[PDB]
Amino acid sequence: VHRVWVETAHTHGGEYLKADLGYGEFPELEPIAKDRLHIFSKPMQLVTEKGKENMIQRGTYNYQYRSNRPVKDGSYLVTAEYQPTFRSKNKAGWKQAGIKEMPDASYCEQTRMFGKNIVNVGHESADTAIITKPVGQNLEIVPLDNPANIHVGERFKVRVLFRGEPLPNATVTATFDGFDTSDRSKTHKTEAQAFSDTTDGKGEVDIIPLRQGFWKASVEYKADFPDQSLCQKQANYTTLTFQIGH
């Protein structure tokens, strides 16, 4: 189960912003395999007051990105995208539903994944103007506060948007680097979460972090594909990564 998230290195004002595209099992960064290169055909983006700009893929490993120019103190976003892929799917094999799960009617599903990291450049940067503005991801987590203001046990409010509109009753989970240290023996399981709740009618939910560290919130949403003459289903997987304390 490979998912997309974004990591940013600790950055000061006046130096280049280094960021990492995570594709795999959080929190372990892995080189993008040959057969997956085509999925990440557009670079990660840096979102500042000037808007969105492409980052440059450079560094030792192919998941490393650098800002075009040095960045000044502020609170910015780094966004990544798994470009849409189509796959054939079929339903079968559940505990006590029934063997004949509509006996093999195959269907198309489009997979999209999105990542977004909140990066605070400068020790005292806690701005909200940039990071609280949606960037247009099909499924999006939008922070409503800067996580630099959130201490352990306090509420960090976020909003889930699907196709530009608030998504009620969506499940948002969250975990941190270090919570789950079991190995690759899962091989079918995502990591354990240290938080879970559902969004309210405004698409909003308060994440309550119980430990400091590097956190990842996750929401996924499966829906009908918009144009049914081309494909039937759409699966969206989105994360928001951020620091609490530390």
Add this chain to the structure above:
Amino acid sequence: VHRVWVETAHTHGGEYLKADLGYGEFPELEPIAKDRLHIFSKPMQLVTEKGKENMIQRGTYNYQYRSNRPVKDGSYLVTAEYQPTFRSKNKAGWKQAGIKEMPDASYCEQTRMFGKNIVNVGHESADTAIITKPVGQNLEIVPLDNPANIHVGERFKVRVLFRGEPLPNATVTATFDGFDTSDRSKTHKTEAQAFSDTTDGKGEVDIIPLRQGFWKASVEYKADFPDQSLCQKQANYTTLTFQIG
């Protein structure tokens, strides 16, 4: 929106075990309303070395039970059950936002809910012989360790059973009393969880508590009703309550 869980008072060897049936929104205990008594037609049960025995409904409110006899030091289970009720549902057109909708047709769904509390009597009791044995709840969480042995940040292994068999890929969440308190009211939900993960091929999952307290783990499963000539769907809601630290 109402769910079933069990709470037990702190108990020492030689006193009656007092337990409460929670039906509603954890952790607020509430009297079982007049129109719901028929659902709790059988008393909560205490599971000891001797097996299952009925608890005795005593106290101010109708959710309070006591053991039939004073209990001795040991590690026991207290179980509660929402007896199966049938309702009609239709999915007619409802609730939104990613998929088209609406195969307009009514069907019968059976609801069942289960609660199970791990109660250690005696300050040093951490036995496993009784509490790791399944009691036969249609959807069941079986602890595979005694939670008294689990410190904050450590793994508390449980197994999910459906109809006697391990249930893979089931979501188990867990929360504790006091995790989510803000702006709670009868109209404002406080359902936030401090843990979520899915079961493996053996039905097992490790709960990782990040705080001491009174914890509730939850799992639900919707399946086809067994005898389709009588009813179509079945929804099961099960909890396990326990102390950490």
